[PDB]
Every structure is written in C-alpha cells, then in structure tokens.
Amino acid sequence: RECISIHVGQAGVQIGNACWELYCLEHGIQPDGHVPRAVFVDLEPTVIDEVRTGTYRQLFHPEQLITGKEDAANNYARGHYTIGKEIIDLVLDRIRKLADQCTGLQGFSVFHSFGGGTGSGFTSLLMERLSVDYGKKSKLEFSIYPAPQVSTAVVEPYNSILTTHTTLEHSDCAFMVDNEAIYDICRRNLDIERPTYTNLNRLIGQIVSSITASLRFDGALNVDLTEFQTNLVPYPRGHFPLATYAPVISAEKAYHEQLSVAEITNACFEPANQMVKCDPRHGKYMACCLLYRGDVVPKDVNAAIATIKTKRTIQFVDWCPTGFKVGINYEPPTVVPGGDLAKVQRAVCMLSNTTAIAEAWARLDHKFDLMYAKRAFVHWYVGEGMEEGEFSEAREDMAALEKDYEEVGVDS
Amino acid sequence: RGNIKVMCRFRPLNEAEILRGDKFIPKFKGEETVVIQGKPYVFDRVLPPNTTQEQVYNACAKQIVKDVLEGYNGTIFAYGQTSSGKTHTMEGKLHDPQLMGIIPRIAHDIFDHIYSMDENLEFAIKVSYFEIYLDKIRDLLDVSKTNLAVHEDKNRVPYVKGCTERFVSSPEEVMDVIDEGKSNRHVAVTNMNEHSSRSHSIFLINIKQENVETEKKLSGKLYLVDLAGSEKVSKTGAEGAVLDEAKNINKSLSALGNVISALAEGTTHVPYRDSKMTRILQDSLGGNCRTTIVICCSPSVFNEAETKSTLMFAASVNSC
Amino acid sequence: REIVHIQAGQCGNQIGAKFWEVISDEHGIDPTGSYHGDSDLQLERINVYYNEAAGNKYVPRAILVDLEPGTMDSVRSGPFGQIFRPDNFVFGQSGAGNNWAKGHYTEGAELVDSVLDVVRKESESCDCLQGFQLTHSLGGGTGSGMGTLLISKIREEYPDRIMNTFSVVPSPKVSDTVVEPYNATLSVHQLVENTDETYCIDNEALYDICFRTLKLTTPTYGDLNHLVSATMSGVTTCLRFPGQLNADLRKLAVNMVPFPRLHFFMPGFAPLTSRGSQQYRALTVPELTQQMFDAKNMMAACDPRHGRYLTVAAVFRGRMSMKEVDEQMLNVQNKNSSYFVEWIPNNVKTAVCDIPPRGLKMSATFIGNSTAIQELFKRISEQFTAMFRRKAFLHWYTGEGMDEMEFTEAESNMNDLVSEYQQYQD
Ligand SMILES: CC(=O)O[C@H]1C(=O)[C@@]2(C)[C@H]([C@H](OC(=O)c3ccccc3)[C@]3(O)C[C@H](OC(=O)[C@H](O)[C@@H](NC(=O)c4ccccc4)c4ccccc4)C(C)=C1C3(C)C)[C@]1(OC(C)=O)CO[C@@H]1C[C@@H]2O
Ligand SMILES: Nc1nc2c(ncn2[C@@H]2O[C@H](COP(=O)(O)OP(=O)(O)OP(=O)(O)O)[C@@H](O)[C@H]2O)c(=O)[nH]1
Ligand SMILES: Nc1nc2c(ncn2[C@@H]2O[C@H](COP(=O)(O)OP(=O)(O)O)[C@@H](O)[C@H]2O)c(=O)[nH]1
Ligand SMILES: [Mg+2]
C-alpha cells in the first residue's frame, strides 16, 4: 500500500524538502502534526542540516536523517565505493526499519540527482542493495538528470553514465525531470528570470505530488505504483519516462485558468512543457500515464485522448496499439499559498517513455567520451577504488541503451 | 627495436579446475586474436596453453636482450590477476631447463654473450630491485631504504640514485638476488596458497661493457616489471590499509595506461609524470627498445570476468 | 569539516594577518572576543577555522612559521595579532637568510619537527579534517624553502586531506628580490608534487587590478594582501556555508584538476568597483561574469586570453537565480568557445552559496585553471637558466649544503610542467 522514499544527495534533499512540503500543505498537517515515511542521505552535513535547521524541522526523526560529516566529493567513485560505503549499512537500516513498521508496502520512491557525488554514486549502491533485499517490490527512482547544456559539475557525465549503468539493472521505473528544460517553463510558461532552485523544486514538488500523494489517494480511476512500471515499461531496462504537468500557468500574469480538460491535455504534448530537454524530436511515445486530478469527466478524457490518438503528428510506437493509462483522481491540485503557481481546478501530470531520450542519453554519453578520451578527472576516481574497468565497462553499458532505445522504436 | 607490443598468454586448466565442467569459452583466431564474448580483440601475439616457455621467450623477450647487450634499453611488463600464470611465465622451475620461464632465459642469454666476448671487452652486471608500495619507492635489496629518490643524468633524464646496486657475476647470483628481494616484497595472503602483491615490482639488469682497446663504453638497461592486478575495491571491500592499497594500485595502472596510450599514438606529449613508476621507466620507454607487455589470462568460467579486465588493461596495443 | 591555515614565511605571514583580519569579520570574531556575528549563520560552520576552549575565545587554527622574529613579532604586536595561541608561533630566531636552501635544508629543517608537532596538535583537534591552507611567497627563504618543506611533510602525514596553496609567484616587470627565480623554481617544484590546489597571486597583477579597477592611487601592501585574502575567503570558508548548489575544497578539486600535476589556478573576485562613485550596483549577475571573466581582474600575471581553460569555478555567494547563473555561464562558454578547451563539454563548475560577503549584496569568487599560466612558469624558468648558466648567487645555496643537481632537478621538473600544460592548449 505505501511507498517509502529515499532522498539522496543535496539536490535530492532540496527537491525532497520541496516535494515533502507540498505534501502536508495539501493534507492539512502543519509543521508539527504526524510522521513522514522517508529518509535523507548526504555525505555533506550542512545540507541535511538545512532540514534540521530550516522549515519542516520537527516533522522528521533525527533517525531518518542520515549524514556523513565527512566529504561529499563531486565524484561517483568516492561516493559509491570509498566513502559512500561506510554509510550505506546505516542508510539501509532505516529503509529496513521504516520498511518493517508499515503494512504491506509497494516500494521506495528514490530521489537523486544523477550528476552528483552523493547522488550518483551512493544511490547507485543503495538502489543496488535494495534490488536484492526487496526484489519483490517497486523501485521507481525519480531523477534530475544533467542539464543538456547548462550542467554544473565539470565531470557531471562521469557521474551520470555511472549512476545509470549501476542503477539500470535495479530500478523499476526511473522518472526524469530535466533541470534546464524546467527553467524554460519558468521563463516561457510562468515568466520569471528569477527562478531560485527553491522553485524548480516546487515544480517537481508538484509533478511528484501527482504521482504518489494523490494517486495512492482514492479516486475515480486509481493507479497503483506497480500499475506504473506495468503500464509504463515495455522492457526490463529500468526505463525512464519523462514528467510533464499541464496547468503550469502563472498565478499573477495571465488568467484563463478555466481551461477545460480538452485544453490541459493538449498542453502536455507540446514539447515546451515537459520538464525535460528531450523535445519529441522524433521519439515516438510508447506509453503514457495520464494522471489527472480535480474535476474531470471520464468522457472528457475518453475523448480528449481520442482526439490525440488521431493527431498522428504525435506518432506512437508501432507495436503499441493503445498506450494511454488514464489515471483520474478527485481532489484538485494544491498550489503553494503564494509561490508563483497559478492554482487551477484540474491538472494533467502525464509521464511517459519516449524513444526521444534516444537523444538525451546520446548527448550525455558523447560528453563522457570526450573527457574519458583524455582521462580528464579520472585520477579522481581511480584513487577512490574504481578502475579503467568500471568506466569503460559502464560506457559499453549505456552503449546498448542507445541501441535499445533505438530498436524498441524507429522500426516496425 | 622500437614499437611497443602486447602479448597474451592463456595457461592450461589445472587439476583444480575440471570437475565444474567449464567448457572452452575462448575460440582463438589466427595467432593474434582471442574471442571471448565482448568487443573485438587483437594483440601483437596470443600464446595458447600448448605454447612452450621457449616459444614465449623468443617472441616476447629475445630481441630486447640482444638490444640490451648492444647497449640499448628495453622493458618487459608482466600483468595478470591471481592464478593467471605470472610466476610460471616469468620464472617457472628456475633451475629446470624446459620448465624455466622468462627471467632465467634472459639471464641465460646475457651470460652466454658474456664470456663469449673475452678478447678486448670487460663486463659488469649490476642489478637493482625496488617496489612501489603506497606511492613509496622501497629498496628490496636494502630494508633500510624505504622511501628513495630520483636524480637526473648528464642529459637531464632522471634515474634512481641510491638504488642498491648489486654486482652479479653468474646466472645463479641473479636468481638469489630476485629471491632475496621477493622476501622483502609487500605480499598479502588470503589463503596460504594465494600471493596477492600490494605493490608493483621493478627489477633492473644493467649490462655494462668497456672495450679496453677501443676505450668505448656501453650501458644497456633491462627493466623487468611485475604488475599487481587492478582491484575493484567495491568487491573485496578494502579498507584502512587495503582500500588505500587498492586505490593506489588502480591509480598507477590508469597512469600507466595513459602513458602507453600517449606513446602508442605517437603524441608529442607522453605523461611520464602521471606516476613514479612511469618516471623510473621514462628513459627505457622513451626512445628505446621494444617494450613488451605480457598479459596472463585464465581460461574458463573461473575467470571470464577477471580475464576480461586483464585484456581491457592492455587496450593500447597497436591503436589504431 | 575543517582546515588548518599555514602562514609560511613573512609574506605568507603578513597575508595571514589580512586573511584573518577579513575572515574573522566574515565570522564576527573580535580580536580575542567571540562571535558578535550580526547573524547566527556565521557560526554553525566556523569550526573549519577555529577551536573551542573558553566560550568567547574561538582561536584561529593556523600555523605561523618563520625564521625572522621581527615579522611574527609585528603580526603579534599589532591588531588581531593577539588572537593566535602562542603555541601557534613556530619561530626560528636563526638567520632567516633569503636562501631557499637556508630554509629548506639547513636552517628550516631543524624548526620543522617543532612545527609538524603542532600541525598534528591542530589536525587531531576534533571532528574531521578536510585540508590545510598554505600562504607564502616563492621568492625567499622562510617562504619557498621552509614552507615548501612543511607541505612535503604534511603530504606524507595525511595524503588524504587536501592541500590548497596560495603562492605569490615572482611578479614579472620587477622582482622584489634578486635570486627570486632560485627560491621560486625550487618551491614550485615541491608544489607540483605535494599540494593539489594552488592559487598563484602576483603583486603586480594586483597593483594593476588595484590601481585601475579600484582608482586606488596608493595601494599599500596591506591592500594587495587584503584583496587576495578576499578571494581565499570566497573559496574555502564561503563554501562552508549553505547554498542552492554548494561545493567544498574537494568538489573544487575534483572538478578542477583533470590531470594530477596539481595544477595552479588564478583567483578573481567579483564586485571589484571603486568606493563612492563606481558603486554602480551593476551586479545583477551578467555584471559579475562580465567582471570575473575579463583579462584584467585575474590576480595572476598572465592573461587568460592567452590560453584555453581546462576548468573554471565561479563560486558565487549571494542570493541569485540558478537560472541566471547556470545560463550566463553558457553564453560565456560559447562567446569564447575559442579559448575554453573542448574535450570538456562543460568546463565551468558553477557553485552557489547563499550569504554574501558581509557588507555586499552579491559576489562570486573565480578559480580558473587556464593553460595560460604556462606563460609564467616559462618566465620563472627563463630567469633561472639565464642566471643558473653562470651559477650567479649559487654559492649561497651550495655553501648551505645544497646540490648542483638539485637546481637542475627543479628547473627541469617545473620546466616540464610548462610543457605538459601546453598539451591541452592544443
Ligand atoms: C559602504 C560599502 O558598501 O562599502 C563597501 C565598498 O565600498 C566596496 C568598494 C569594497 C571595499 O574594499 C576595498 O576598498 C578593498 C580594499 C583593499 C583590497 C581590496 C578591496 C571595502 O573596504 C570592503 C567591504 O567588504 C566586505 O565587507 C566583505 O565582507 C569583504 N571584507 C573584507 O575584505 C574585510 C575588510 C576589512 C576587515 C575585514 C574584512 C570580504 C570579501 C570576500 C570574502 C570575505 C570578506 C565592503 C563591501 C565595502 C568597504 C568596507 C568600503 C570592495 O571590496 C570588497 C572586497 O568587497 C572594493 O570593490 C568592492 C566593492 C564594494 O562596494
Ligand atoms: N530541481 C532541482 N535540481 C537541483 C536542486 N539542487 C540541485 N539540483 C541539481 O542537481 C545537481 C546538483 O547536485 P549537487 O547538489 O552538486 O550534489 P548532491 O547530488 O546533492 O550530492 P553531493 O555531490 O555529494 O553534494 C545539479 O545538476 C543541480 O542543477 C534542487 O533543489 N532542485
Ligand atoms: N603580496 C605580498 N607580497 C609580499 C609581502 N611581503 C613580501 N612580499 C613579497 O615576497 C617576496 C619576498 O620574499 P619574503 O617574503 O621577504 O621572504 P622570506 O621572508 O625570507 O620568506 C617579494 O616578491 C615581495 O613582493 C606582503 O605582505 N604581501
Ligand atoms: Mg550536497
């Protein structure tokens, strides 16, 4: 029934504090109410401390807040092997102590930031140690993969080609939200050149609320977590769909809010609104899980979608007749009291697997090579319990992820 | 003299590996290619289980020995995981004529050139033995010299000054020196049979000659490098002094790979400064003889994993 | 986390006074007083530079190494001079001769053990150690020689913790000493092989940047020092603050050093406007990158425009949009694709603290790893040879128990170091 969550890496923790905020906010549980149902991991104390100093301070147990005073290191190796190792046990312990206390759970919603040290590496083995300790569950990892041109870390790819290959054979469904492609939404669909990280977080903090929160919440067309991976992954590769939200209108500027279904659903497939720089440049969808929430008439959907199924310029895979999982919830969304999110009475958090990422992975793989081609910051990992193996052998890994996402599509 | 070459050697399955029933997974091709499920391979030469110690030596070391006796430099690297065949290939049955490896043969050929030239020539054979352990150069011939420095020669090329030089006048003297040094080598024991070495080993054979009548002098350097295998520290679970050992071994192998890759592509810049090992060997890689990297592999399900890694270390051969 | 500063030599020392003059105020620590901190955040992370004893006395955890009493006795007899626990003062009343050899082999080698002693008392302080900060000048005895030894020992004692080095490489135009290239070439040698992050500052790159980027007409040393200390605060201490995207010595190290040499950087501060007038506030952000990335404004002597970059780390510290930050960096990376090296898709390492420099609204430290610094070690290396060739003031070295092969060594080493760095400019 439940779904634990492990927010790993400063980012996964910032986003965590955010997604965790939106929660109580739409459940009437102020600062000090019940008890969360997740944990927080980081090898840099000062960040988890922000959850220990700032807002939502006492809504957590100093037990579900793991820290390694030591060093973060923007390098996979160190975070996965060398350092990150020391903490893992302890980490697990909570996701085994928190996993017990419950009643027939469904899985762990993992929150990490692909291209980091504590986020890429660590998790790599966290999800790793999970796939074995609970192979019998769902492992949906919600990632924030590398901005297409606006990356931060100098190494980023090293850290992301490595978190992909190690987690690939362990996740159930990996959701992806592109940090940059979300900015566009903040520039083009909300207008603000002042987007603090605290915003992107409010956003995913939204799209995510549509996943677990409301879905695990009764409705006219419930959709379990398992449901996802089933209706969402055509193949064992921990396939990565993309998150998209519909009413991303500004709560100040424009106001046409009352944008009946027929509109908000069409607003999902236009590439300028998908929290991912993977513009459907060719990527044929192969399965979409249209999660609606608020006042929505099933016919409105079983029509708004029909209209789409016949737009053709939206070309769905061949081997897939119908790939539209319509998830209907009741309670409308719940916007921050005064952030910058419109606040409509219905939304569409549609996520999907698109042959599109054939790109995004490509462009991120290429990156890697360029540097590896010169070993660049390699000495930083080797000296951290890794080898020419793990790199070269994780490169070959993704290689067959560029072929995979190519074969499962583009061909009939 | 002077292209770099890597040579692969597969050992037979021992008494130990047969009951399991591991089927022939390696389907050799030609005399240079080995196919295991992977990427396509190719090396300068691939020696099967049937290939003699004599046949192995002639192809990998014989030309380097001739160059050293002619006054030039040369280097021989031996790489492989535990139970790959390093000991058997490099030393074997040290006193037996058939069973002897690479080192007793080099030493045989050197002393066969010596004596045969006693007419106007005066020979001096100087040996040195050091290990690189925890990024420190430890003399294996003097236990007091645990942290040792380079200085530069007449041309501004570095060399290991203070390295205990031992004068050797026979093939038996060289073997005794190797044995003495081995007893000082940083070894680790998982099981009594296993010999993990947490350190890279460098054995130096310096062949000095003075032509009494011509007054002309030669000094050829032969470097025998024993490489500890790359360690996946996630596996093994190294820690404290082990994890620091594993990182250090891995770093050194990366450095070495970066150096050989640079020299293979005939690049202007060769990153000898990446490790203390590549700097000790700088003069003997640089502008010298036919460096040979001998990589030892195990056949069977025993090691498709570690065998694969052993071949990926060697990825610089002939590129491209 | 933590670090332990090291004031090697006079310069490195003089600067200590300025680095601590600043940092303290950037942490509300009065002379011997405690935390008067205008805020409450300038305390949760102080540890990085102090120690708890009394309850109002957080003492800087640095080391003051020098063979010339008068110096430390000027730093200890002035302003903040009375905050260092006397135990910190590792003096060498000997003759602090201006010889690299006199402070590395003969005179300094003695005072070393009595230093390492303390560098251990401070390291074994508490919590977890990160690395050590090292200030000095590569143009003297107590600086290049003895300080370059202090590290060679440090890096044998904790090859785990990092080593940032702040070197005052011998300015071009005019040398404030004569053997300079001797004391220098010899110390850079030691650097390229122990510390793993070096920030090279040039007394004349500063003047310039201090007399034209600050209409400042009488730039006393105190100033230069002050400007420098401003950068080293943005680096360390800063990142030991919160941030949307924070980093720390390692990130900085693990994102800036592609190849083990250690490589040296060139720090640059952001708002560098003259007092009154200039107070243009054009600091929205494009103004900071405008700044940081220009030629002038690079504390180094060389000009970036003269050689690609390998890595860059804009360590900003003041509330801004992870969008207008992450964005700007890009155009910058495209307007100058020419010089920014290619085999690194994203050279830049954007870092973002929150709280800014006490009195300012928005700043951003720049730590560049450009191949341009090739044209400096060249300089140094040249000066050497031109004088080595004639063994100029060599008797002051050898006569101190040195080697004719020692000088050879260093030059070559550091000389090769020039070579390599070009391997990427191409
Ligand atoms: C009224 C007002 O706003 O005054 C400003 C000011 O006028 C200006 C000109 C300051 C001023 O700085 C200088 O004039 C200066 C003098 C010698 C060397 C270098 C700089 C200032 O003195 C410096 C001072 O800086 C700080 O307070 C920072 O926290 C800074 N602190 C110190 O350097 C410091 C100085 C004395 C004692 C202890 C610390 C800092 C910067 C980076 C990291 C840590 C701390 C500031 C904003 C100002 C004055 C006071 C006039 C500027 O410098 C800095 C470092 O902020 C020079 O260009 C900038 C722009 C500022 O607007
Ligand atoms: N959406 C969103 N992205 C974030 C947030 N914080 C960081 N990121 C992104 O995630 C990545 C940053 O990871 P870091 O903060 O460097 O590292 P970490 O994953 O927390 O772990 P360490 O490297 O060990 O500190 C970058 O790509 C950022 O753009 C956030 O609050 N929201
Ligand atoms: N920025 C700066 N440079 C200094 C200071 N003091 C000396 N220098 C520089 O240091 C060099 C001289 O070395 P010095 O510090 O006297 O050596 P030592 O005292 O014998 O170790 C010259 O290039 C000076 O410009 C200072 O307080 N600030
Ligand atoms: Mg973090």
Token duo for residue C138: 């590569």
Residues B178, A145: Cα–Cα separation, whole Å:
54
Of the bound ligands, which one is closest to the alpha carbon of residue C219?
A: 1
C386 and C341 co-located in one domain: no
Q: Domain A242-356: what homologous superfamily?
A: Tubulin/FtsZ, C-terminal domain (3.30.1330.20)
Edge-to-edge strand ranges of the sheet holding C364-370: C89-91, C62-66, C5-8, C131-136, C162-167, C197-199, C264-268, C364-370, C309-317, C348-353
Radius of gyration of chain B (CA): 19
Method in brief: cryo-EM
Residues of A in contact with C245 (CB under 8 A): 10-11, 152, 197
Query: CB B251 to CB A383 under 8 A?
Result: yes
Torsional class of A242: left (φ above 0), alpha (ψ -120 to 50), beta (otherwise): beta
Q: Burial-class residue B148 by CB neighbours within 10 Å (0-12, 13-18, 19+).
A: middle
Residue of B nearest to A389 (CA): B309
Could you tell me the maximum CA-CA distance found in chain B, to the nearest angstrom? 66
Pairing, β B292-297 against β B217-226: unpaired
B182 backbone φψ class: left, alpha, beta (φ>0; ψ -120 to 50): alpha
Rounded-to-integer distance, Cα B262 and Cα C54, Å: 58
Does the annotation count A63 as an active-site position? no
- Tell me the C-alpha distance between C120 and C154, whole Å: 9
| Shortest Cα–Cα distance, A202 to chain C (Å) | 14
Q: Which residue, B312, B84, B63, is CA-closest to B195?
A: B84
Q: What single-letter amino acid sits at A398?
A: M
d(CA B297, CA C40): 62
B273 touching A (Cβ < 8 Å): no
Nearest to A380 among C44, C244, C254 (CB): C254
Residue A59, classed as helix, strand or coil, is coil
Within 8 A by CB and 6+ apart from C211, the residues are C217, C219
**Which residue blocks in chain B are alpha helix, DSSP H?**
53-60, 62-69, 86-90, 103-113, 171-182, 242-264, 276-280, 282-285, 304-313
Buried b / exposed e across C373-412, counting CB within 10 Å, b at 16+? Answer: bbbbbebbbebbeebbeeeeebebbeebebeeebbebbbb
**Residue C209 shares a structural domain with residue C350:** no
Q: Kindly report the protein residue whose alpha carbon is nearest to atom 16 of ligand 1.
A: C223
Question: Is residue A277 within 8 Å of A360, Cβ to Cβ?
Answer: yes
CA-CA distance, C307 to C263, in Å (whole number)? Answer: 15
Q: Up-side HSE of residue C185: CA atoms within 13 Å toward CB?
A: 27
Q: How far apart are CA C370 and CA A229, in angstroms?
A: 47
What CATH number is given for A357-412 in this structure?
1.10.287.600
Question: Cβ(A72) to ligand 2 under 6 A?
Answer: yes
Question: Which CATH number belongs to the domain containing residue C289 in this structure?
Answer: 3.30.1330.20
The whole-angstrom separation of Cα B243 and Cα B234 is: 9
Strand intervals (E) in A9-60: 38-42
Whose structure tokens read 């490509």? A362
- Backbone angles phi and psi of A39, in degrees to 5: -140, 165
What single-letter DSSP state applies at residue B11? P
Please state the residue numbers annotated as binding site of C: 10, 68, 137, 141-143, 203, 225
Distances (CA, A) of A178 to A204, A208, A276: 10, 14, 4
Q: How far is the C-alpha of A43 from the C-alpha of A122, rounded, in Å?
A: 9
First to last CA, chain C: 38
Q: State how far the alpha carbon of B112 is from the alpha carbons of B66, B177, C13, C50, in Å.
A: 11, 19, 65, 69
Ligand nearest, relative to CA of residue A116 = 2
Which amino acid does the sequence have at A131? Answer: S
- Backbone torsion region of residue A308, taken as left when φ is above 0, otherwise alpha when ψ lies between -120 and 50, otherwise beta: alpha
Write out the H or E segment, with its range, that includes residue B5: strand B5-10
Q: Is residue B248 a part of any domain in this protein?
A: yes
Task: Specify the CATH number for the domain of residue C209.
Answer: 3.40.50.1440
Helices (H) and strands (E) in chain B, counts: 9, 13
What 8-state DSSP symbol labels residue B227? Answer: P
**Separation in Å, CA of B132 to nearest CA in chain C:** 15
Would you kindly state where each structural domain of chain A is located, as residue ranges?
Answer: 1-241, 242-356, 357-412
- Give the 3-state secondary structure of B184-216: CCCEECCCCCCCEECCEEEEEEEEEEEECCCCC
Cβ of residue C329 closer than 8 Å to a chain A Cβ = yes
CB C420 to CB B271 under 8 A? yes
Rounded to the nearest angstrom, the distance between the alpha carbon of C203 and the centre of ligand 3 is 9
Burial of C298 (0-12, 13-18, 19+ CB in 10 A): buried
Å from CA of C396 to ligand 1 middle: 42
> Do C51 and C174 touch, CB atoms closer than 8 A?
no
Chain B residues in contact with A82 by the CB 8 A cut-off are: 233, 243, 247
Does B268 reach chain C within 8 Å, measured CB to CB?
yes
Structure tokens belonging to residue C67: 């063979």
A152 annotated as ligand-binding: yes
C197 neighbors C159 (Cβ within 8 angstroms): no
Q: How near does any CA of chain A get to the CA of B247, in Å?
A: 4
Helix (H) / strand (E) element for A200: namely helix A197-215
Question: What is the distance between the alpha carbons of residues A27 and A32, in angstroms, rounded to a whole number?
Answer: 13
DSSP string, C286-350: HHHHHHHTSSTT-SSSS-GGGS-EEEEEEEEES---HHHHHHHHHHHHHHT-SSS-SSSTT-EEE
Tokens representing B162 are 């203070």
Given the CA of residue C66, which atom of ligand 3 is nearest to it?
Answer: 21
Which domain CATH number covers B70? 3.40.850.10
Backbone dihedral angles phi then psi of residue A180, each to the nearest 5 degrees = -65, -60
Sign of CA dihedral B62, B63, B68, B73: negative
For residue B297, CA distances in Å to B8, B160, B206, B259, B306 come to 7, 32, 30, 23, 8
Q: Number of structural domains, chain C?
A: 3
The alpha carbon of A20 is separated from its chain's Cα centroid by a whole number of angstroms, namely 14
Whole-number Cα distances in Å, A57 to A39, A51, C107: 14, 6, 56
The DSSP call for residue C10 is T
Could you tell me if C149 and C338 are in contact, meaning their C-beta atoms sit under 8 angstroms apart? no
- Under DSSP, the state recorded for A122 is I
Cα separation, A92 vs A132, in Å, equals 12
Strand duo A107-112 + A140-143: pairing: parallel
For residue A356, give the nearest of A272, A271, A291 by alpha carbon.
Answer: A271
Contact in structure between C172 and C138 (CB atoms under 8 Å)? no
Closest C-chain CA to B136 = C156
Residues sharing a CB contact under 8 Å with residue A260, sequence separation 6 or more, in sequence order: A300
Look at residue B184 and tell me if it is in a domain. Answer: yes
HSE of B195 in the Cβ direction (CA atoms, 13 Å)? 12
Q: Which residue has its alpha carbon closest to ligand 1 atom 31?
A: C22
Partners of C185 on chain B (C-beta within 8 Å) are none
* CA dist., res. B185 & res. C118, Å (int): 35
Instruction: Pick the residue from chain C with its C-alpha nearest to A44.
Output: C1
Nearest by CB to residue C405, choosing from B152, B268, B274, is B152
Distance of CA A86 to the CA centre of its chain: 26
Give the type of residue at B127.
V
Q: Which of C1, C372, C247 is nearest to A154 (CA)?
A: C247
**Residue B320 resides in a domain:** no
C-alpha distances out from residue B239 to A193, B136, B242, B245, Å: 48, 19, 5, 9
Q: Find out whether A257 and A334 touch, Cβ atoms under 8 Å.
A: no
- Residue found under tokens 């050689």: C307
B239 lies in which domain range? 1-315
A76 touches A119 (CB < 8 A): no
Residues in chain B, how many?
320
Q: Do B233 and A383 touch (CB under 8 A)?
A: no
Task: Give the pair of three-digit tokens for residue C144.
Answer: 């290049």
Q: Is the same domain home to C133 and C38?
A: yes
**C-alpha of residue C11 to centroid of ligand 3, in Å:** 4
Is B269 part of the contact surface with chain A (CB cutoff 8 Å)?
no
Write the CA distances from C21 to B320, C14, C24, C60, C408, integer angstroms. 58, 11, 6, 11, 40
- Point out residues after which chain A has a gap (C–N over 2.5 Å): 33
Token pair belonging to A203:
């956003």
Pair C298, C192 in one domain: no
Is A10 one of the annotated binding-site residues?
Answer: yes
- Nearest Cα of chain B lies from the Cα of A72 at a distance, in angstroms, of 18
Q: With contact defined as beta carbons under 8 Å apart, do C336 and C383 qualify?
A: no
Q: State the CATH number of the domain containing residue C410.
A: 1.10.287.600
CA A142, CA A131: separation in Å to the nearest integer? 16
Task: Give the domain A1-241 fold.
Answer: Rossmann fold (3.40.50)
User: Quick one: which of C344, C357, C356 has its CA closest to C312?
Assistant: C344
Which H helix or E strand runs over C110? helix C108-123
d(CA B293, CA B272): 17
Atom of ligand 1 nearest to the CA of C234: 43
Q: Across the interface, which of C1, C251, C327 has its CB nearest the CB of A150?
A: C327
**In the numeric block, which tokens belong to residue A150?**
């606006």
Q: Which of A26, A50, A128, A227 is catalytic?
A: A227
**How many domains would you assign to chain B?**
1
CA–centroid distance, residue C230 to ligand 3 (Å): 18
Task: Count CB-CB contacts under 10 A for residue C37.
Answer: 16
Of B135, B152, B274, the CB nearest to C409: B152
| A35, two tokens | 């008890």
Residue C133 near residue C236, CB atoms below 8 Å: yes
**How far is it, in rounded angstroms, from Cα B239 to Cα A381?**
16
| Cα–Cα dist B312/A303, whole Å | 56
- A300: Cβ–Cβ under 8 A, 6 or more apart, which residues? A260, A261, A262
Greatest alpha-carbon pair distance for chain C in Å reads 61
- Evaluate whether B303 touches B14 at the Cβ level (below 8 Å): no
Q: For C271, which DSSP code? A: -
- Could you tell which of C168, C182, C209 is best to mutate to test the pocket of ligand 3, judged by most ligand atoms within 8 Å of the CB? C168
Q: What is the CA(C25)–ligand 1 centre distance, in A?
A: 11
| Structural domain harbouring C379 | 375-423
SS3 call for A110:
strand
